[PDB]
Design a protein around this ligand. Sequence first.
Ligand SMILES: [Zn+2]
Ligand SMILES: [Zn+2]
Ligand SMILES: [Zn+2]
Ligand SMILES: [Zn+2]
Ligand SMILES: [Zn+2]
Ligand SMILES: [Zn+2]
Lengths: 84, 87
Amino acid sequence: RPYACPVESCDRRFSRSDELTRHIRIHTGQKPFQCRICMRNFSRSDHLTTHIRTHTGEKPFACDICGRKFARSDERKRHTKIHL
Amino acid sequence: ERPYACPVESCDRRFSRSDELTRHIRIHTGQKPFQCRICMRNFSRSDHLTTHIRTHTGEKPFACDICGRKFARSDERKRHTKIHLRQ
DNA sequence: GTGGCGTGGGCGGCGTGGGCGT
DNA sequence: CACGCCCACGCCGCCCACGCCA
Ligand SMILES: [Zn+2]
Ligand SMILES: [Zn+2]
Ligand SMILES: [Zn+2]
Ligand SMILES: [Zn+2]
Ligand SMILES: [Zn+2]
Ligand SMILES: [Zn+2]
């Protein structure tokens, strides 16, 4: 488990370099990605896409039992648990 | 099933999510993190505090579609709505 | 009766951190 | 490194419901 967070307060360790680098961003407040629509900055590109579905109403994802729709899969995973 | 189970003695209460169990546990720990800054009373929940604040500012966002009467909360409006269907 | 309101439960919205596949 | 799933946690804020109070 080779990549060590080299900030002092943090012993956190990562299996790959892309992991660490992404992690460092939380000590830096760095948010690359910007919303073409709200001007809000976020730390990652995947989150900015899930984010965008908040304006556009994009909503992949369906509850197999009631076919209610959600913006993300975590949302439907969690939703589906309420039928059982 | 409901995976998250309260581990306390006489409470046999379960929850699909763990954020629900984290909220439910405060009823046992009498904790009350949220505070009205006007009367300084404290609440177990941020949403119950937001409607509590209404009793001070008189905000009443919810209007009966039948009669226009305004309520602090929608369930107050709903309970009220029943009286039009009645006698 | 009608309405004020504390307060728990269900559950969707959504930020955002790790793990990891390609 | 890049993109982009899957997953997990935590808080927010709605609806509802009940129940006690004036
Ligand atoms: Zn670190
Ligand atoms: Zn936006
Ligand atoms: Zn469903
Ligand atoms: Zn309990
Ligand atoms: Zn108050
Ligand atoms: Zn009315």
